[PDB]
Design a protein around this nucleic acid. Structure first.
Lengths: 242, 242
DNA sequence: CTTAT
DNA sequence: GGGATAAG
DNA sequence: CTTAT
DNA sequence: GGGATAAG
C-alpha cells in the first residue's frame, strides 16, 4: 500500500518532521525594536490541565525548551495553547508576501494534466528550526519559568511565507527531475498533476520519497492519491473545472 | 430725512407691500401629484393664543383668507405660526435655482464703487400674489375651518428663487437708467454701490422711489445709507475688502 | 408635531 | 440603528 | 486574556 | 462611541 511503501514520508509512521537541509532561521527585528515582556494572566486550573499534556509532548519532542528571555507573551485558554504574539509581530521586520493566492495558483494547472494527488504536510512550521539567537523572541511563561520554541511557531506573522519559500527551495530539484509534472505549492498544501495514472503514480512515489528524505511529513489520513477528482484549497477539481 | 422723503418706500410708513406689476403666480405641480391632507395635531391653548393675533392681522391684511381645500398641512407651535410644507414641496415641480451664492455675487463689486447703501425688503415674499388656482395648495386648519395664503408663503421651496426673479424683472429698468450704479440682489437683501457720496445719494433716492412705486418696502430701522462701510450678507465691506 | 441627516 | 438634532 | 475592525 | 465580534 501507499502507507507501507513510504513509512518515512507519512506523519503517522515517520515521526515528527525536521527540514534537515534548511538552516535554522534568523528572524530580523525592526531597526528600533526592544523586547516586550507581557505578564501571563492567571489561567484556570481547567485550562492549565488541558494545555499540560501538549506542553509535555512538545518538551519531549524538543520543540519547546526552557529559557530565560526578556521577551514574554501570554498563552491564551482556547484545550491546547495559543500564544498572543501580536506584540512580537509588531517588532519583527516585514518581509514581502510571496505565497500566491489560490485563484492565481490554480491558473497554472493546464487541462492536459488531469490525474491528481493532494498532500497536506503535518506540523509544517514545526519542521523549520529557529536559530538560537531568535528563539528567545517567542518565550512564554509555564507554571515557574519560561519556555520557548526551537521551531517556527504558530501565530508568527512570517511563518506561512518562510515555510512556502523553504519548501520551494527543497523541492526545486524535484521539479527539474520531473519536468512533465505540475506541482502547486500553497504553504503546507500540495497538488501534483500528471497526464496519466501511471505518471501520477510514479510522480507521487518520487514526491513522497523526496518529502520524507527532506524531513517533511504528509498526512496519510487525508491524502488523496492518484484520483481524477480531488479537493484542493477549497475547490473540487473535477472535469478540469474550478 | 430719508424717512420723511420716501414715505411709500419704507415698511414703517408705507404699509404692507404688494408687487403691483407682477402677475399672480401659478405654481405648477409635478405630473403625478394629487392633493395631500394632513391632520392638524391639537395645539395647546398657550400656542393657540400666541399664534392668534398674527392670524388675525394677516386676515385683516388679506394675506390669509378662508377656504375649503383638498390640501392641508399642519401649523407648528414654535409664538408665531410655522407651516410644515414638506409634503406640499415634494408635490410641486422643481425650478432651476437662479439665486447666486453670496461669494460670487460679491465678485461683481469693483473697487471703483466704494459708497454703499444696503436695504433689506420687509415681508418680501408676501409682496408676491398667488394666483387663485394655486392658493388652495397652502391651506391649513384654524380653530373650525381652513385658511390659506393669497401671497407667496414662508416655507415654500421656490419662494426665494421666484422672488429674486420677480424683483430682477421689476428693477431691470432701474439698472438701464443708472448704468453707472452697481446693484446686487440677493432675494430681499440689496446693495447699491456708487463712485461718489452724491452719486450714492442720488441713486439711493431713485432706488427707494422705484421700490415704493413698485410695491416693495424696505426696513428703515435696518437701512445703511450712503456709508463707506456696511454689513451685507454677513460680510463687513470696508476698504473694498471682503 | 413629524421627519431628514 | 438609534437617539440627538435641526428644520418645516 | 487583550485588542483590531 | 460602544458593544458585539473575531482573532492572537
Amino acid at each position: 500500500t501507499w502507507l507501507s511503501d513510504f513509512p518515512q514520508a507519512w506523519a503517522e509512521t515517520g515521526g515528527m518532521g525536521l527540514a534537515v537541509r534548511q538552516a535554522p532561521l534568523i528572524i530580523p527585528l525592526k531597526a528600533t525594536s526592544t523586547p516586550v515582556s507581557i505578564k501571563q494572566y492567571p489561567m484556570s486550573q481547567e485550562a492549565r490541565l488541558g494545555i499540560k499534556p501538549h506542553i509535555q509532548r512538545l518538551l519531549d519532542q524538543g520543540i519547546l525548551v526552557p529559557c530565560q528571555s526578556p521577551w514574554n507573551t501570554p498563552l491564551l485558554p482556547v484545550y491546547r495553547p495559543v500564544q498572543d504574539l501580536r506584540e512580537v509581530n509588531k517588532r519583527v521586520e516585514d518581509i514581502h508576501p510571496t505565497v500566491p493566492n489560490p485563484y492565481n495558483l490554480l491558473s497554472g494547472l493546464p487541462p492536459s494534466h488531469q490525474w491528481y494527488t493532494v498532500l497536506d504536510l503535518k506540523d509544517a512550521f514545526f519542521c523549520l528550526r529557529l536559530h538560537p539567537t531568535s528563539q528567545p523572541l517567542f518565550a512564554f511563561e509555564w507554571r515557574s519559568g519560561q519556555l520557548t520554541w526551537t521551531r517556527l511557531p504558530q501565530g508568527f506573522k512570517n511563518s506561512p511565507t518562510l515555510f512556502d519559500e523553504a519548501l520551494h527551495r527543497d523541492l526545486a530539484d524535484f521539479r527539474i527531475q520531473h519536468p512533465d509534472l505540475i506541482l502547486l505549492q500553497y504553504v503546507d498544501d500540495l497538488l501534483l498533476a500528471a497526464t496519466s495514472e501511471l505518471d501520477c503514480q510514479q510522480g507521487t512515489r518520487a514526491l513522497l520519497q523526496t518529502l520524507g528524505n527532506l524531513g517533511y511529513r504528509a498526512s496519510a489520513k487525508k491524502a488523496q492519491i492518484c484520483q481524477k477528482q480531488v479537493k484542493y484549497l477549497g475547490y473540487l477539481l473535477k472535469e478540469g473545472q474550478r
